[PDB]
Design a protein around this nucleic acid. Sequence first.
DNA 1: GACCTCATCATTTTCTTAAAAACTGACACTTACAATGTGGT
DNA 2: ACCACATTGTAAGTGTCAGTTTTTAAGAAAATGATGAGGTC
Lengths: 360, 362
Amino acid sequence: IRYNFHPTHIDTTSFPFEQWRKYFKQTMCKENHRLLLNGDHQGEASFRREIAYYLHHSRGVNCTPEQVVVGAGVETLLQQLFLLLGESKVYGIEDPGYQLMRKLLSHYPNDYVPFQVDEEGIDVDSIVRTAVDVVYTTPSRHFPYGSVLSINRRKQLLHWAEAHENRYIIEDDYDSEFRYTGKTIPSLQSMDVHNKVIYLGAFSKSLIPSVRISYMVLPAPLAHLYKNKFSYYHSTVSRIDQQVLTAFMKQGDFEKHLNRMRKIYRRKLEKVLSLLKRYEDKLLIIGERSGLHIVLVVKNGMDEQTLVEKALAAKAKVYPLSAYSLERAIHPPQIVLGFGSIPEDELEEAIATVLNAWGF
Amino acid sequence: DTIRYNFHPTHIDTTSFPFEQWRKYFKQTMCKENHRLLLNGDHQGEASFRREIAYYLHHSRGVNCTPEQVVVGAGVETLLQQLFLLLGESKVYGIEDPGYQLMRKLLSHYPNDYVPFQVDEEGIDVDSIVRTAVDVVYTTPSRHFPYGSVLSINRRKQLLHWAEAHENRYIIEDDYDSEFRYTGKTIPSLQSMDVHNKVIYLGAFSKSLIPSVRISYMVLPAPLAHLYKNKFSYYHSTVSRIDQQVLTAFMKQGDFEKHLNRMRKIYRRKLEKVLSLLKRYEDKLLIIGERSGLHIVLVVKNGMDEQTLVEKALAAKAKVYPLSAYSLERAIHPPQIVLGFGSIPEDELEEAIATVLNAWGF
DNA sequence: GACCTCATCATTTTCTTAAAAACTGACACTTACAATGTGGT
DNA sequence: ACCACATTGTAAGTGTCAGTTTTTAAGAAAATGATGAGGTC
């Protein structure tokens, strides 16, 4: 309550309401009644022929609107994939990451194998010397430190899968065009030519979290397996919330929302680092100056379960780094702050009362 | 596909939803005072969209429950796959025949095993189930595809003690269709007749309201709501915080029950028009289950096979749906065909039925 | 022989403000399909 | 006791007046790129 530094939220008071309302009135009007009965089972092609036009001009992704699949959430976007694969597979999760591929697979007979990371990337040699079949990396930005995979590891990891023809690799975006200097690199979907990596996108940190649209992109000989095996399903996103975001990205008002949103977070990043570079005796920063959240490491010798529970007395919650890693971390207790939803004209009191609560 | 004169048993009429009363509540919720409602709140739905269903269904269909036991979802299949893993992999699942073509095909991705039954004019073959080894069976109390055979009251009190015999058995009910029967409105729900918690409730706002709002509630009993919140505490919802907080104010301040009664009378006015027109022939076309809801089944005693009859209606660009799909086995030497009217408008019914009849050789 | 702090320059897509324009809020009217009490033999 | 006929009681039919609402376009305007000025080490 009252101060919630969530690690991946968004700011509340800045999305355009009165611009969002106008594109509804071409969608649900008195001629429009064939937008009521249920259409195609994976979103209307006016929503996918624009996604294939957008990700070829902003992230270097190469895809066609008969292969991209829409869905809702990620947990419903992933559960149809585990049954599509089979049940003779052994998964790959990086050691601190998003707590998602693990927490699903507590229901299925499969097994997940961790793999170590560093400030250059994740390990690739242990990917070689085991028998893993599906691995899950975020090549644009590594949660939650902020590491970026180089080109030196990408050729090795993509060439690991080409020699034996039954392994896969899942890219999770989580954030792009929020870098403040430009688009990072062309993503790992761009460098594939043998159709071995699947995408997994999002529409929920960029624009609005609670509209529950998302998307993956399938490769060539798996798209006509998913369409063959699940041709008796239904779509999951409400079709009046899809032709909103067809004209929204045919007539160009998303490509002026994210560019507008960039500076509203950069102006928070500079005013949060100009408050933390005074107390540089202990509160070190690990990870780059990008994204929506910082990772302060506290060398002041208090314990983590006291450090989080100390902030709750003055109606403020932070998010620790015990639940994000399987093993137990170093003696300096890392703590993840965020700056998405805290507004600008209360940052210099928010961080002040947090660091006043901990130690002056 | 896109076609003219589509006759589907779920395609509701499109030209009678109060667009203005859809938009007066939609414009009310996106205000500057009404942020805190664009990020993610609760996961089983908004905490008032669940409070309101427990005073909609309680006095419109009879179900006694609490808003701590409700589960919202999306579709109904995403509401079923978050049940198929709450029970185990030691169960066997009982479907009807004929029925909806869902829970046969959904159970082909799993190691669970299903066994069919038969359906008579009193309901389902309840006498077969007591001497068979099934563990969860899925039935439709208040109606039945594709006939209309309401469950007779003796078999309901039999199938109560069926699932109240042991400890590991459950039953599902599927009352997709209610408040759309002409008089004696609907027999009250199988959830109401149970007082020992072995039946789960399952129904949806996508036949009444709009085909693509994609909301389906669910009710849970006490020893599965607790077991769902525990082993599913890390999901989110699958419907928005605007598609729910429209229908909270859409139902709090009146304009749902007026739509209910208006759509209740419109479809009776549609049905009697069909019963007037098709009665002029009873030579080869007997009609079964003439009374209820949104679809009739229309037999045919043509001197040729049933396969030619569905594809002959494509010759004049019309769509009809046979009954060799809703059943496992195929021995229908009387050719059965189900039809619908719920999408066709009144002004072209006269040409419409004459298209398919004289397309069949009249 | 290296790293990295301020300008101030021309092209440009965001930002409050302003004066003509489709519209819905709260009356009253104001008919139409049809619910329920008082009579036909 | 067996077989109807008509009142008040409202869901509807366009319009009233006004009001809190939507749509087009032009200067300043905050602020991004090729060029030109120092510092530290």
